[PDB]
Structures are given as C-alpha cells and as structure tokens.
Amino acid sequence: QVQLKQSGPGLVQPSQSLSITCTVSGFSLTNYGVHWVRQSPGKGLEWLGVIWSGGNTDYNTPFTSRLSINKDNSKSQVFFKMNSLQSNDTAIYYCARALTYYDYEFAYWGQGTLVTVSAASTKGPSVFPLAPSSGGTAALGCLVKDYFPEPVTVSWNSGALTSGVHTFPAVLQSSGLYSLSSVVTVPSSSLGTQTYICNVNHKPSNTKVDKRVEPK
Amino acid sequence: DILLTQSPVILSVSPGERVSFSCRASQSIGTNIHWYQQRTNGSPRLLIKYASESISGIPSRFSGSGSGTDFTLSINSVESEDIADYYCQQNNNWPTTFGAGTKLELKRTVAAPSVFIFPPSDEQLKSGTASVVCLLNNFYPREAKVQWKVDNALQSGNSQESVTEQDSKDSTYSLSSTLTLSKADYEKHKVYACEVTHQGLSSPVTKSFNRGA
Amino acid sequence: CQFDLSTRRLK
Ligand SMILES: *[C@@H]1O[C@H](CO)[C@@H](O)[C@H](O)[C@H]1NC(C)=O
C-alpha cells in the first residue's frame, strides 16, 4: 500500500543544516504532493511546507528563509533541508501525504525522524544484562546505558517476543547521556529451554548489539 | 494564524463510557477541521476529516461534529486501545495549524505492582559503575513510592525513576527505579533493598539481596 | 502539557 519511509535519526550541531530523505511507495510523486510536519516540545505540531506534483513548493512563513524541499520523481524521493538549526529546532520531523492531491488532510505519515540539535558528541550505549533469579514468573531485561542522542530501539528475540515487554522511557543522567531499561516477564520453566536476546540498535552511532540474558 | 484551543488538556474515563474532545478556533473556519490520534511512539493517525466525515479503516466508534468555531470529537464506547493524545487541525486559512492536544487516560481497578530487584552485572562492574534496578510491574494507579536502603542507610538523590505510558491492553503502568553507585561504594556495602509502597499493597513490599549471598 | 520526544506522548 501507500508508505513513507524516512532516513534515520541523528545529531546536528548548532547553526548547521538538517537533511532528511523521504522515500515513498504505493503512489507517484507526480500525482501527489508531500508535506513536512514537525513536532517539538515547545510548539507541538507545526506544518513546515510542501512540494507539489508539478515541483512547486510552499514554505510556512517563519521558515521561508532556511527551508528547501526538492525531490526526484524517478527515485521516488523527497529531500528536506533546513539551515542554521538552534536548540529549539529539536523535534520529530515527519513527511506526510494527503488523501487528495491538492488537500491537507494527512492520511499517510512517515515514521518520523527525531532530530537533536546539540553540540555534544554521538556516543553508543553499553548493554548490560538484568539477569533473572514470583509464582513461576521470572523477570529479565537489558540495561542500555550512556548513549547520545535519543532514540534507541529495543526488540526481543528479533521481534518474536513482544508479550510482556516494557521498554522504559529514557532518562537524562547528570553526564548528559541517556539511559533506559527494557524488561520482559517469562515463565520460569522456559529459562532453561529458551534463549532471551535483547536486540539494541542506536542508529545515530551505528551501534548494534545483541545481548544474551541468562540466569547468573 | 488560526489558534485552535483544545480543552480540557487531560481526560480520564472508564471503559465503555462515552467521551468528547473539544477544539475551538479563534475565528470561524466552517467545517475545515481534521482530527488525529497519536499512540505511544506513533505517528499521527487521521480519524475524522472535515468535522464529521469518516475515514477508511477507522473504527466506527469515532465520530465528529461541529461548525463555525466549536468542534467535538466523540468516542461512544472507550476501549483500552484508545489511550493516546488527540489533536485537531484547521485548514480553512493558510497556513494549516494544529491544536495542542488532549490526553486520554483510562481508569481501571486497583492493581498491585509485582516487584523485582536486579543486582549490577559483573560486566558493568568492570567499568567502575554499579546500577541496581528495582522493577515495579503492571500496577494501577500511577502513584508509587520506591525507597532505597543500603545497609540501612537511606539513599537519596542517587536514583532515577522512569514510568511507561499506559498499556494499551490492561491499562497498567510499569516503573523502573535505578540506583547508581560507584564500584568503590558498591563494594563497601552488603545489603541492597528497594521498598515499594502502593495503594494495592496492604503493607510495603521489600526486595533485597546481599552482594554475593 | 508538553510533548515528549522520547515517548511521542503528551506529558
Ligand atoms: C525558536 O526560537 C526562536 C527565536 O530565535 C523563536 O522565534 C521560535 O518561535 C522558536 N521556535 C520553537 C520554540 O519551536
């Protein structure tokens, strides 16, 4: 069906430019326009601009000076570029498509790209096990520590294990690095026959770790 | 720009009850309003277009009404999977603008937390830092107290909490409490206990371990 | 309420 897939999240230094690629399928960029919306803590949802079927662009007023949208109809890609970012440009950026070619009701959205504006460094996380040791139900997990910036994704057994999974929201430590835990509850009797691996991927650092969690 | 004011900012109802969201425009916009749903870690999901028109794949319990400046999104029988934030969007005047949203929380019966405590791994100790994690699993409501004690000394300022958003299936929360020591301080002590207080427990539950045995 | 970049939910 109709899908919009965006490039990965990453860090951008202050007063530097941001580039996101929106690759679409299920429709042609020659028949529909692609919009760009962002979502920040301060201003919430904020419509930025649009590139139309014919190649024209409209930019929201406060961004006409630093926004630039382009596309490649053959490669089915829309290119978003915003110049000179400051801390308060830190937000999730979406690409979206409307129901009709001319309208603004957004029925299809990209998965979003979390952009962090900061002068810090990208750092991958260490992954430490939370080993099990209540009524035949054991709890185990993974400690994903000292990374920057957000986000980080955590699955269990390559997506096959979802029931009982709790990946907690990341918290900012005094060091300026994030840390979180992802836990799951399983039957105690399965700790002998089943392997439990947390699949951690911190795309901003291209750090990909699989941690086996055993009883100590 | 049209300012869209959504009120209230938080809604809290029980399953099966009907709920209404309000979105008011700073001037008349006719019926040019759209409604979106955003679940945890999700992108917006178009629910209603032009005040009242249905969207494919959206459950029928979602509907909308209004005209001029006062618009209402309604769910006639709230389910657990409806926990999200809800936004309105106007497109009668350029540029299109969104409201600030309303949070939908769900009530349920009291559920006591299941408590688990995890010592720091020997892998982490090789780096000079110890993390002691105390897990409070599947409880309601959100209010909970976690008290850390190391050799009967009250810990304060050296722990951080994190609470998941509400679960879409059973409406419970889960909480992690992470006590952080240096490896030096962790090796100078023996007993590590997190005490948990919750409405669903008749008396505080304490999980503890001795470094080693 | 403020939007949370970590959970994509309002806090
Ligand atoms: C960012 O700060 C500028 C001032 O340089 C302000 O005009 C703008 O509204 C802010 N944008 C946000 C908070 O998204």
Residue numbers in the entry:
A (entry chain B): 1 to 133, 138 to 220
B (entry chain A): 1 to 213
C (entry chain E): 1 to 11
Task: List sentences from the manuscript.
Recently, a unique binding site for a cyclic 12-residue peptide was discovered within a cavity formed by the light and heavy chains of the cetuximab Fab domain.
d = 70 nM, or a ∼2.3-fold increase in the affinity compared with the original meditope, and showed some improvement over the long meditope. The lack of extension at the C-terminus in addition to reduced charge at the N- and C-termini results in an increased on-rate. Overall, it was observed that the disulfide bond used to cyclize the peptide favorably packs against a hydrophobic ‘pocket’ and that amidation and acetylation of the original disulfide meditope increased the overall affinity ∼2.3-fold.
